[PDB]
Design a protein around this ligand. Sequence first.
Ligand SMILES: CS(=O)(=O)c1ccc(-c2nnc(/C=C/c3nnc(-c4ccc(C#N)cc4)o3)n2-c2ccccc2Cl)nc1
Ligand SMILES: NC(=O)c1cccnc1
Ligand SMILES: [Zn+2]
Length: 227
Amino acid sequence: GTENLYFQSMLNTSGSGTILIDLSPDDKEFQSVEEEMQSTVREHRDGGHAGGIFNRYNILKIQKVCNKKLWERYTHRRKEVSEENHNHANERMLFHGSPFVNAIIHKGFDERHAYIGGMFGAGIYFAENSSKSNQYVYGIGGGTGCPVHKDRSCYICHRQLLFCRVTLGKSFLQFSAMKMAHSPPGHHSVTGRPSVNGLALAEYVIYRGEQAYPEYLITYQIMRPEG
Ligand SMILES: CS(=O)(=O)c1ccc(-c2nnc(/C=C/c3nnc(-c4ccc(C#N)cc4)o3)n2-c2ccccc2Cl)nc1
Ligand SMILES: NC(=O)c1cccnc1
Ligand SMILES: [Zn+2]
């Protein structure tokens, strides 16, 4: 596509203030995000042990997260990374899943709530594939599942993902485990690459919460296959 759907300028809400904007399914912005959500689903190695067993989702809502402070903090970081990387910010849309969605869209991503015991250390993790971020909606490795039924493969409870503007800058390409506290020298993010005897699907790690904007809030639920 050659239309500017994902990377439009944000305008002053008022603001306090996180305001959600309801996108109608007839809008091409809704449809693009929906299709990106649906088409990037892969068959996982766990057998769906973490994210659940599915092929597609039931997209219920796609809202656009509008926050003045979070925006004028992302742009400042983006401009900074750009200047340190030959005017190339390396911005792209990536999925994100965590139990902290409500906090992320009100306060922004927060590195100080990282993990350090992750594959690439104390960073905030993003994915090309929507079904990968889905494995982290109810916590690391799926956690105990949905709060109501304790089911990691629940088709009843509604879930939320984030489709985010991510500034990658000069990304450090890694195959093996490399537990970082910050982005490696000269770089601004880490890219986990697919490889045999390693990762099956890619992943992208930043170490500054200001380096990502939670543009799209997706309310969905995984769908039972037939059968
Ligand atoms: C299993 S793994 O691949 O290594 C892996 C590791 C880490 C992540 C990963 N990537 N991003 C996050 C969380 C980001 C975040 N931003 N703000 C918050 C927050 C805000 C307020 C409060 C309060 N009160 C708590 C948190 O969180 N996480 C994460 C961190 C700890 C626990 C679970 C997860 Cl998903 N994703 C995957
Ligand atoms: N929490 C996530 O969305 C995520 C994305 C990629 C890898 N690990 C976790
Ligand atoms: Zn449930």
